[PDB]
């Protein structure tokens, strides 16, 4: 189906990439699904999670605290679907491994498999940024795992340029 995502470069048949702030993209597009770079406790302190939560005026955190009180922590490589608040219909909170916690990078493929439960997503690169993994490797795993239509937002221009110029 035609959609309103604009300005993306096509990497493969189903993976698209743009130098953009995921918060601003979400506000403009109002996608069905925005992906959060979550941790197992849904503590949205920094990185993408801190930015998305701030954009919701902390409503994402309040909802998340209730989710954890009822259900307990997620698994590394796991996910849950919560409200998208003012950003999207839904937020898919996905836990990539955090290398700075010693977590196993093979779980990155499991993390990306959650995307296949949604026909279209706006997402960051999983395990990138403060999660400590190599973003070039994360993009490779994304391409090789996700089969649904994923629109990747990369805020850092220098990183965006490197991801494009090194893509196989």
Curated annotation (Swiss-Prot):
Residues 2-168 form the Macro domain. This is Papain-like protease nsp3. It is found in: Host endoplasmic reticulum membrane. It catalyses: Thiol-dependent hydrolysis of ester, thioester, amide, peptide and isopeptide bonds formed by the C-terminal Gly of ubiquitin (a 76-residue protein attached to proteins as an intracellular targeting signal). Changing residue 165 to L: In strain: Gamma/P.1. Inhibited in vitro by GRL-0617. It is a multi-pass membrane protein. Responsible for the cleavages located at the N-terminus of the replicase polyprotein. Participates together with nsp4 in the assembly of virally-induced cytoplasmic double-membrane vesicles necessary for viral replication. Antagonizes innate immune induction of type I interferon by blocking the phosphorylation, dimerization and subsequent nuclear translocation of host IRF3. Also prevents host NF-kappa-B signaling. In addition, PL-PRO possesses a deubiquitinating/deISGylating activity and processes both 'Lys-48'- and 'Lys-63'-linked polyubiquitin chains from cellular substrates. May form homohexamers. Interacts with N protein.
């Amino acid at each position: 189906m035609v959609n309103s995502f604009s300005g993306y470069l096509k990497l493969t048949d189903n993976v698209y990439i743009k130098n953009a702030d995921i918060v601003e993209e979400a506000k403009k597009v109002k996608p069905t699904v925005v992906v959060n770079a979550a941790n197992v406790y849904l503590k949205h302190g920094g990185g993408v999670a801190g930015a998305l939560n701030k954009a919701t005026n902390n409503a994402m955190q309040v909802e998340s605290d209730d989710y954890i009180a009822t259900n307990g922590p997620l698994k590394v490589g796991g996910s849950c679907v919560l409200s998208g608040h003012n950003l999207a219909k839904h937020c898919l909170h996905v836990v990539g491994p955090n290398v700075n916690k010693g977590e196993d990078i093979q779980l990155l493929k499991s993390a990306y498999e959650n995307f296949n439960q949604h026909e279209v997503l706006l997402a960051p690169l999983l395990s990138a940024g403060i999660f400590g993994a190599d973003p070039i490797h994360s993009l490779r795993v994304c391409v090789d795992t996700v089969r649904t239509n994923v629109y990747l937002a990369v805020f850092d221009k220098n990183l965006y340029d490197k991801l494009v110029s090194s893509f196989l």
